[PDB]
Enzyme design. Structure first.
Site, PDB file in Angstrom:
ATOM      1  N   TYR A   1      38.971  39.931 -23.703  1.00  0.00           N
ATOM      2  CA  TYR A   1      39.975  39.416 -24.882  1.00  0.00           C
ATOM      3  C   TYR A   1      39.262  38.913 -26.149  1.00  0.00           C
ATOM      4  CZ  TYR A   1      41.776  38.455 -20.484  1.00  0.00           C
ATOM      5  OH  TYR A   1      42.466  38.483 -19.087  1.00  0.00           O
ATOM      6  N   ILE A   2      38.089  39.892 -26.449  1.00  0.00           N
ATOM      7  CA  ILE A   2      37.201  39.590 -27.551  1.00  0.00           C
ATOM      8  C   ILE A   2      37.067  40.919 -28.243  1.00  0.00           C
ATOM      9  CG2 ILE A   2      34.812  39.098 -28.000  1.00  0.00           C
ATOM     10  CD1 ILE A   2      36.342  37.490 -25.219  1.00  0.00           C
TER      11      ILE A   2
END
Lengths: 433, 184, 433, 51
Positions: C108-109
């Protein structure tokens, strides 16, 4: 008197996002949005392999009022020719098999748009725009041969179900090519992919069967099983119910085309003869004879769903859509080519005027030749385009040969003017193969 | 005061870098929690993070909803898939053990956005995809950024989304047994 | 003698797969790969936070012959503004913290190149490529202030181990700007990021100390601990062995920046008076003082390795390589600008002969204009660029504007002609901020 | 499972071999080169007659 505002909103759920495709395109709305994302990830390079998540994660601004997973596994399921006949989308990777009807991943397999889509989906941009603003795909893409008969739809909607079975492409080619000619429409034959069994009519309903092949007194090699079960549900529903009785046993030797399972007879069974009751015991036990149902329940160009007993009227309504939807292109290209030859005469006459050079250009300021271009009847509609003139125009090779391509677009101008809809649609039907 | 039942050491790192020490609290979660109502009340007492939030809020199981060290309980998740259907049914099922928390409405939700465009000096704040649909007719400089996750915002957006939240309520229909049996 | 074909293979596992960085770019071998992958995606959208899977799965064709998990967690660990002083590569996501030095996930980065990198890494594209053909990043990138002094690098190779320490930004800027002048080289000062304690020397070596504050007779507020202590390893390694004797206890009251650890003594302790043995018991028990060691070992511009006792010669060698690699840029810009001056002069002279039209221009069919301009002494060499001439420039305003551009080019060509290494490098050193 | 499939029982010679040849292919970047090849070689080096 406000609760109906929810119910019509419930009608919002049950009009534009049903599982029933439309009768022109043969396309589900989810398939329209994933086709739009496939071409959106194609753009210039069609041959570029799109990522499945990049296909699926980008549908959200394309018109889908749902998530990415339904388009994600829809793209996985219609990517494979082991289930369908006409490939709507090519891909790098495996998307299933006849032995195993499961794809590889929702996030590994590549995708691209196939060339035969463009060989059958010309004029998909002249369709009128939708009522809803989110539907940037057309309400029906316009084919030469529709996808209602191409491939199969097995869907359940609000009170309506489709099990529209695939047909053989030479038969639908003859059917559309002959319903163009206006005689009694040939019914397209059904050919499931990689199938050497027997699909036959009994009474109004197509039953399917494969091939089972006896090889010895107590052995067979099953060539095909019916298209309702691939391996393990087939075993759990058929092969383990008859194997757990002790009657017969099987072994896994599945080949390249079809199936290859080898069946060994044990001793307690009928073991009948005369080739009437043993074959009947096989189709009662091995389940070769399988029965389906057919109902062409498909929405037309308007919001009403039309129910057809037979696809001859489907092909007739398809071609009655397509004739006027390409006469629109006929009128558009006629109105394009008249002003195209008018600008052609502008450029050819002005470049013969320039290579003549009777107009003087040197020491002429403030675009002074436009002051003698604006009082021409014919150059004055093209002034900017006709002062957009680099030095390579001034060579008379690209004056005279550009005049002869003005004559080449004259003969193409009369080629689009003399032609009509039926013979270019005959070209459409004849150049797909 | 409030307690943020947010997710992970990332969000409590941003929360330590953002919050007021007097007003806003916080607590992360250790990991995956199972279905809430398949387990006995002594087995909610056997569970670790539920005992942790029973001790931090002071509302241990078997007692009336009083002596709460935090007057508010907020839960702060990722708006892609990480807490939109994973943290919330289990956490609402555990907070369904005290219906007086729901009667006073002491559980809230802070909505992290979905789409953000960076226009001018002050970026915009489409909270959902529906507002992104409804306000795409008049929105300039469409450079899209996705907020699929808590990490997809920086410290400044985290600052103006803690110090100016929306505090969305939790679900409470006329029956609190019929809607929680759907997932099983 | 082919077992050395194993062993020299060990010498491409113990020379080019070493963890030793370089003096020039201050980069590890994998850092050039993740930088090249991020800039390969930067292009126009150098602000779109590209997915760490797309960086991490993207370093396959960059020439990194190891796992994607290494770069997948490396980009997580070097995108932190709190682990390191100078922001090199930004992003949105978790990149570690002083509470927990881990990321929340890697999926999610998303990461990003910084504009400050391009404020500080000019002559990136001029960098010569590595001897190995597969290395798509070059041999070393080129900074204005080095990345050996800034932000620190730590690792252990076979026989050598680097522990280079982070330094403050203004002192590294003053160090490079002051060793460029050839004076006594200022060693840069050390500022750990978000450190309000005290960093001082003991004996040739730095100590780091945080902040402890007497708040009552039997209470403590450790406002800061030294830099290599997080929360729970310091609790379980020191504070919990202090807890199990019944000596002290802790409260979790961590502040806005730094720590906030409040520690209350118990009565079964020393609790000594007179402010020299209680503080002795504090930094021997709470561990308020931490020491280290220094060893500046770093691979030079070729594959060999060199050891320094100080960063003074490191800054000197960095600026003495930087002098020649700005001098190469000076010569390249000079050789660009002289031909660009003669070309712009030719085009301004030809726009004067166009807006005059003293060239015979009409009736020069079969390119008789450029057969007249192929015998001009300077127009010949760029005939293919003297011929791209519309009619749009026949008005004299653009002719005078291109003459103004020509005069502007002259002074520009004089500005990049008369210049050298020192003033452009110190203008870069001024405008890094 | 693979010692039952091959027929080489643990503690005996390579006899009653169901497959005469054993071949391994994996994704040859890091998925099977340095990960499952040394583990399978540590399995198969316990029978050095296979080597």
């Amino acid at each position: 008197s406000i609760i109906d505002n929810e119910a019509l909103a419930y009608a919002m759920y049950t009009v534009e996002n049903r599982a029933i495709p439309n009768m022109i395109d043969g396309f589900k709305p989810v398939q329209r949005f994933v086709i739009a994302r496939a071409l959106d990830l194609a753009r210039g390079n069609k041959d570029k392999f799109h990522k499945l998540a990049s296909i699926a994660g980008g549908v959200a601004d394309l018109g889908y009022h749902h998530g990415e997973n339904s388009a994600q596994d829809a793209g996985a399921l219609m990517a494979n020719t082991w289930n369908n006949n006409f490939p709507l989308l090519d891909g790098q990777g495996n998307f299933g098999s006849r032995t195993v009807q499961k794809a590889a991943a929702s996030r590994y397999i590549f995708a691209r748009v196939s060339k035969n889509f463009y060989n059958v989906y010309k004029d998909t941009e002249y369709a009128p725009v939708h009522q809803d603003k989110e539907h940037i795909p057309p309400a029906f893409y316009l084919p030469i041969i529709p996808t209602v008969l191409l491939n199969g739809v097995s869907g359940i909607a609000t009170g309506y179900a489709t099990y529209i079975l695939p047909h053989s492409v030479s038969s639908v080619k003859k059917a559309v090519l002959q319903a163009l000619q206006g005689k009694k429409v040939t019914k397209p034959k059904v050919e499931f992919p990689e199938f050497r069994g027997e699909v036959v009519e009994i009474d109004g309903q197509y039953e399917i069967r494969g091939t089972y092949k006896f090889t010895s007194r107590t052995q067979m090699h099953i060539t095909e099983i019916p298209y309702k079960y691939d391996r393990e549900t087939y075993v759990s529903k058929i092969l383990d119910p008859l194997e757990n009785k002790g009657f017969i046993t099987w072994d896994d030797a599945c080949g390249e085309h079809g199936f290859g399972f080898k069946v060994k007879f044990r001793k307690e069974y009928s073991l009948s003869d005369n080739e009437e009751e043993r074959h009947a015991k096989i189709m009662k036990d091995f389940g070769l004879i399988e029965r389906r149902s057919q109902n062409i329940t498909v929405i037309n160009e308007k919001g009403k769903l039309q129910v057809y007993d037979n696809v001859v009227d489907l092909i007739k309504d398809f071609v009655e859509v397509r004739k006027t939807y390409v006469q629109k292109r006929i009128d558009n290209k006629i109105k394009e080519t008249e002003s195209a030859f008018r600008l052609a005469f502008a450029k050819a006459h002005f470049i013969k005027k320039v290579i003549s050079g009777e107009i003087v250009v040197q020491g002429k300021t403030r675009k002074e030749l436009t002051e003698e271009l604006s009082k021409i009847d014919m150059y004055s509609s093209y002034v900017d385009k006709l002062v957009g003139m680099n030095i390579f125009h001034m060579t008379s090779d690209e004056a005279k040969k550009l005049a002869e391509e003005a004559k080449a677009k004259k003969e193409e101008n009369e080629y689009w003017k003399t032609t009509d809809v039926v013979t270019e649609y005959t070209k459409d039907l004849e150049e797909i193969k | 005061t409030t307690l943020f039942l947010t997710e992970g050491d990332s969000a409590i790192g941003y929360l330590i870098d953002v919050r007021d020490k007097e007003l806003h609290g916080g607590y992360p979660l250790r990991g995956k929690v199972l279905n809430s109502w398949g387990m006995s009340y002594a087995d909610m007492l056997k569970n670790k993070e539920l005992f942790d939030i029973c001790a931090i809020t002071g509302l241990v199981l078997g007692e009336k909803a009083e002596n709460l060290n935090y007057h508010n309980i907020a839960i702060m998740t990722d708006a892609d898939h990480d807490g939109l259907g994973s943290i919330y049914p289990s956490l609402l099922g555990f907070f369904s053990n005290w219906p007086e928390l729901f009667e006073q409405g002491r559980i809230r939700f802070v909505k992290t956005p979905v789409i953000i465009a960076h226009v001018g000096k002050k970026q915009e704040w489409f909270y959902t995809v529906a507002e992104y649909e409804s306000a795409k007719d008049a929105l300039p400089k469409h450079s899209i950024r996705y907020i699929k996750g808590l990490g997809s915002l920086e410290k400044s957006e985290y600052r103006e989304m803690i110090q100016n939240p929306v505090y969305d309520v939790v679900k409470l229909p006329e029956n609190w047994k019929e809607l929680f049996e759907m997932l099983m």
